[PDB]
Amino acid sequence: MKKIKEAEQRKLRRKKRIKDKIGRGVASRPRITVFKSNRYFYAQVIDDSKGHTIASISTIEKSLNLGKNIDDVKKLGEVLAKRLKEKNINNLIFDRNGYKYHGLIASFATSLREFGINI
Amino acid sequence: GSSKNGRDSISKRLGVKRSGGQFVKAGEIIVRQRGTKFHKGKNVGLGRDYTIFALSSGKVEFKTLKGRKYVSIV
Amino acid sequence: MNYVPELKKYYKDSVIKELVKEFEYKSIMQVPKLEKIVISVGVGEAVRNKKLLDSAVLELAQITGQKAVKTKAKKAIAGFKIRQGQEIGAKVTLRGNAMYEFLYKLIHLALPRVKDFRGINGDAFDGNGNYSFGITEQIIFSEIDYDKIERISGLNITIVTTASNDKESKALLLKFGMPFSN
Amino acid sequence: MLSPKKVKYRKKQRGRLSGEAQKGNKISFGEYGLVSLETNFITARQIEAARIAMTRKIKRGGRVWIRIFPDIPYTKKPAETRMGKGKGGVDHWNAPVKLGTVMFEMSGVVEELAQEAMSLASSKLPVKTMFVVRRDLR
Amino acid sequence: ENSRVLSCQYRSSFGSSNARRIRAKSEIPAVVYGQGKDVSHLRIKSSEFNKKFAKFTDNTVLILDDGKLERCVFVKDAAENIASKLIYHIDFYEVDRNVELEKYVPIKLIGASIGVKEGGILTVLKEQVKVRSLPLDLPEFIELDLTPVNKGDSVLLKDLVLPSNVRLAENDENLEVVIIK
Amino acid sequence: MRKDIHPKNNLVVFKDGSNGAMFLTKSTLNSKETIKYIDGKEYPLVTVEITSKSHPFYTGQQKFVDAAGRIDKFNKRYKKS
RNA sequence: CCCUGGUGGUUAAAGAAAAGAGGAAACACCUGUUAUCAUUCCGAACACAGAAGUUAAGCUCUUAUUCGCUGAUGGUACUGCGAGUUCGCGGGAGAGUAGGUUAUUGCCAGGG
């Protein structure tokens, strides 16, 4: 009850502070946010001048058939990079979205980095 | 038995310097205050002493959200 | 091998079933379980005697198996002549396998070795399934040796349970065989 | 006497008191009330003089409620001084009353005896008064 | 039955100055709301109101007739100036004339009780009773004579002799209204 | 966790001298003696004189000696006057 | 498209409490601490590795509005001005009363 509620509350507070520390995204340099469920892994690129998701990816996508490991998110970030290049976006701001930059997120981010995306 | 007190500081001239709807250019001071009596919205910045100033030319506007006042340049 | 405490085995293989039947719970893990055991000791006299606090911390380490933390003064007070931030208490948290093993050790071995041990008041419940009670002579635990103690000391034990009421936790403790004075 | 037992500040500025009463203007705890017809200050000590009058007139018949409490210092400079130093010192306590304040309330006794007792009280206050029955019960 | 009827006519002034002028013409501004209708703004004759309802309680119910309609209204509020005995606004809450409704009604104690005569102790446990009736038949106050009530006697709620179409509503019927111990 | 501030926990078999029950319990106490538990596993054996089932509280209850029968004891000798 | 999840926009609480309903997918609970990682002790949180079990809680929806929040129409206070004087013109609360309220919506992903 109260313990789960306060865990949620802490997550929200962290999320909000992160958001206004990094600022909003613009069509030139939109914002990349992630979400880490118990099963999957989601990423969205958002332009807040419109509230529009320019691109997105997740491990639910059957064709990718990745898992939920460091290796899998490496490949997933590769796919995201190749999907964004054809929509000619190279600058992104990395909203860690209430998580700690470590492990899976670290591998995701570095994978977007080796392939010419400025985060 | 004289007066034990009688001591006052110099008035600091706080308050809103540009009224909502006025046209300002970059760098104008909008509010002088102690503390965020008014908070910062789009296109404004907060000085080290909570002064509100305009980052770009535009028109001042005040909004209210959950009872807090926000200053913006639109 | 995932080595498992015998208490965990006993719980998982019987107690879940008996409590489901006995409290007609609809879904299985509506069953109560244990989340943490907090062992606390408050040495206010440590403000004079650092040796007291050091001895308490060390003896807690031998008793449980993991190191303790010395809490500080929340508020500076004069009745006990307390200055805010001074080291006043020491506590240990036990969770999971260590928690189960320590509770087994306690119930079967240390509660027996208490002078005039006639059970434990089966009413020290905070109304929300948390059972807190004291032990005055740590020497009941055979882990610590008698010679090295610098002053006989006691300590409080709080057991935190997922139960929503006292009845559930008392039933779980009785199934565990906790010697309540009844 | 009647006086507050603790104050934030010992001396306060004499306002201008005006207008009728918009609150504390209805009979609440009793049967008969002593409304005022002016706006002025009633000292604590006149308050207790009126209270003695009412209570003594009433031979245990009923109860008396006092609907005002002074809580306002009244300062006065020493006897022989000039206009120099400032804000001399508290002397006695005043309560504020406006046209329509109930000011006094009585319970238990017959209406005639109450009216007599409460004229006896009004004889000692500095404001015009009016004795009112509930005007919505009998 | 007339003594429960009240004549009004509509007003369209709606100002502080306008209301003062009306009261100078010796009338009373008033509003009627309830039953989800649009509020009706009207004015009343002060002399008529004083003559008829000089003793109005929260439970008084009456009839408003604008010459063209009838309304059953409670006196929800009346803004009275005590010093000048001056009414200066009335709020009328309308109810449905044929819908049973509840209302706490005060008691009025009469007679000298034998028990208290002989050494009984008044304890007025209940100052009011929840009754039930159609609006036009609600009792203004329910009477109770204590004269036969001897020592060590409590008053049952059923013991209250009640007007014709008025009925008890208390969940606890056996609670005591006044005791004499 | 970090690992440098913990006494060495060890699986230990506690043997009651009275009832013979043995308890498997991870105690930091190093026992000089070793015992083969039922599970064919070697564990430091610590012999403890008092245990759970041999409570003087669970099983052997209080012996109320000469409290209520005071009348009986006085009757049996000093009653023949 | 609808459901679910994520992420915004518009501000009146879009607030908590209790009761009932579900859970395909999705979300969460949940499982182990062994690898990197974290706690002034604790795998609780954080972190990594996963699919045995469940709506129990979180979550969504439905309830008497139970608490809160919001709240008219009239009237009053107050007030600018006035050769009408407790009056003439204009502005108009707070409290209370009748009520109301358990949000709405943009585009991304999964499958209906």
SS3 readout for chain B: CCCCCCCCCCCCCCEECCCCCCEECCCCEEEECCCCCEEECCCEEECCCCCEEECCCEEEEEEEECCEEEEEEC
| Alpha-carbon dihedral C76, C79, C82, C87, rounded to 10 degrees | -120
Which of C140, C139, C121 has its CA nearest to residue C131? C121
Chain E partners of D136 at a C-beta cutoff of 8 Å?
A: 54-57
Which of C180, C159, C151 has its CA nearest to residue C35? C159
The count of other CB atoms within 10 Å of the CB of residue C46 is 21
Task: Report how far residue C154's alpha carbon sits from residue C41's, in angstroms, rounded to the nearest whole number.
Answer: 7
Angle in degrees, 0-180, between the axes of helices D111-122 and D44-57, rounded to the nearest 10: 150
DSSP designation for A111: H
Whole-number CA gyration radius for chain C: 18
Asked if strand G contacts B34 at the CB level, meaning under 7 A, the answer is no
Residue type, E136: L
Distance from CA of D136 to the nearest CA of E (A): 4
Task: Report how far residue C135's alpha carbon sits from residue C150's, in angstroms, rounded to the nearest whole number.
Answer: 17
Phi-psi region of A6 (alpha: psi -120 to 50; beta: other; left: phi over 0): alpha
Query: Do chains D and E touch, with touching meaning 3 or more CB–CB pairs less than 8 Å apart?
Result: yes
Distance from the Cα of residue C136 to its chain's centroid: 13
How long is the CA C12 to C1' G111 vector, in angstroms? 38
- Please check whether residue E56 touches D, CB under 8 A: yes
Asked if strand G contacts C132 at the CB level, meaning under 7 A, the answer is no
Q: What are the strands, taking DSSP E only, across chain C?
A: 34-42, 69-72, 87-94, 120-121, 130-135, 155-161, 180-181
Tokens (6 digits) for A30: 């939109």
- Please, which chains are in contact with C (at least 3 CB pairs closer than 8 A)? F
Task: Report how far residue C66's alpha carbon sits from residue C95's, in angstroms, rounded to the nearest whole number.
Answer: 11
Number of H helices, E strands in chain E: 3, 13
Cβ contact A18:A96 at 8 Å: yes
Give me the phi and psi of E131, to 5 degrees please.
-115, 180
Q: Is E106 helix (H, G, I), strand (E, B) or coil?
A: strand
Chain C partners of F27 at a C-beta cutoff of 8 Å?
A: 105, 143
Q: Is residue E21 within a helix (H) or strand (E), and if so which, with residue range?
A: helix E16-24
Residue type, C5: P
Distance from the Cα of residue A56 to its chain's centroid: 9
Task: Report how far residue C64's alpha carbon sits from residue C97's, in angstroms, rounded to the nearest whole number.
Answer: 12
Task: Report how far residue C89's alpha carbon sits from residue C45's, in angstroms, rounded to the nearest whole number.
Answer: 10
Q: Let me know how long chain B is.
A: 74
- Give the contacts of B58 (CB within 8 A, at least 6 positions apart): B23, B24, B43, B73, B74
Task: Report how far residue E109's alpha carbon sits from residue E161's, in angstroms, rounded to the nearest whole number.
Answer: 13
Give me the phi and psi of C125, to 5 degrees please.
-115, 135
What are the beta bridge partners of residue E180?
A: E122, E153
- Give the contacts of E89 (CB within 8 A, at least 6 positions apart): E19, E28, E29, E30, E31, E77, E78, E79
What are the beta bridge partners of residue F18?
A: none
Asked if strand G contacts A6 at the CB level, meaning under 7 A, the answer is no
- Please, which chains are in contact with A (at least 3 CB pairs closer than 8 A)? none
- Give the contacts of E86 (CB within 8 A, at least 6 positions apart): E23, E80
Which of B16, B15, B26 has its CA nearest to residue B58? B26
Q: Which of residues 36-95 of A have CB within 7 Å of strand G?
A: 36-40, 42, 44, 46, 48, 51-53, 56, 58, 60-62, 67-70
Asked if strand G contacts C96 at the CB level, meaning under 7 A, the answer is yes
What are the beta bridge partners of residue B53?
A: B29, B45
The count of other CB atoms within 10 Å of the CB of residue E93 is 14
Give me the phi and psi of D113, to 5 degrees please.
-65, -40
Give me the phi and psi of A38, to 5 degrees please.
-65, -15
Asked if strand G contacts F1 at the CB level, meaning under 7 A, the answer is yes
Distance from the Cα of residue A50 to its chain's centroid: 18
Q: Is E8 helix (H, G, I), strand (E, B) or coil?
A: strand
What are the beta bridge partners of residue E166?
A: none
Which residue of E56, E82, E107 is the best one to mutate when testing the D interface, meaning the one whose CB has the most D CBs within 10 A? Answer: E82
Chain E partners of D99 at a C-beta cutoff of 8 Å?
A: 83
C vs F: CB pairs below 8 A? 54
Tokens (6 digits) for B3: 């007066």
Note whether D86 contacts B3, CB cutoff 8 Å.
yes
**What residue is closest to G107 (Cα–C1')?**
A52
Q: What is the 3-state secondary structure (H, E, C) of chain D?
A: CCCCCCCCCCCCCCCCCCCECCCCCCCCCCCEEEEECCCEEEEHHHHHHHHHHHHHHCCCCCEEECCCCCCCEEECCCCCCCCCCCCCCEEEEEEEECECCCCCEEECCCHHHHHHHHHHHHCCCCCCEEEEECCCCC
**What residue is closest to G30 (Cα–C1')?**
C29
Distance from CA of C39 to the nearest CA of F (A): 16
By C-alpha distance, the chain E residue nearest D37 is E83
Read out DSSP for C19-66?
Answer: HHHHHT-SSGGGS--EEEEEEEEE-GGGGT-HHHHHHHHHHHHHHHSS
Task: Report how far residue D86's alpha carbon sits from residue D75's, in angstroms, rounded to the nearest whole number.
Answer: 10
Which of C89, C121, C107, C84 has its CA nearest to residue C6? C107
Task: Report how far residue C64's alpha carbon sits from residue F7's, in angstroms, rounded to the nearest whole number.
Answer: 9
- Please, which chains are in contact with E (at least 3 CB pairs closer than 8 A)? D
Asked if strand G contacts E33 at the CB level, meaning under 7 A, the answer is yes
Tokens (6 digits) for C162: 């997922």
Cβ contact F11:C90 at 8 Å: no
Chain D partners of B2 at a C-beta cutoff of 8 Å?
A: 84-85
| PDB experimental method | cryo-EM
- Please check whether residue E82 touches D, CB under 8 A: yes
Whole-number CA gyration radius for chain F: 24
Tokens (6 digits) for E161: 């002799």
Cβ contact E65:E9 at 8 Å: no
DSSP designation for F31: P
Which of F33, F32, F13, F56 has its CA nearest to residue C105? F13
Three-point CA angle E86, D100, E60, nearest 5°: 45
Tokens (6 digits) for D34: 């002593």
Distance from the Cα of residue A76 to its chain's centroid: 11
Note whether F55 contacts C112, CB cutoff 8 Å.
yes
Q: Which of E54, E57, E83 sits opposite D35 (nearest CB)?
A: E83
Q: Is residue E179 within a helix (H) or strand (E), and if so which, with residue range?
A: strand E176-180
Task: Report how far residue A46's alpha carbon sits from residue A54's, in angstroms, rounded to the nearest whole number.
Answer: 6
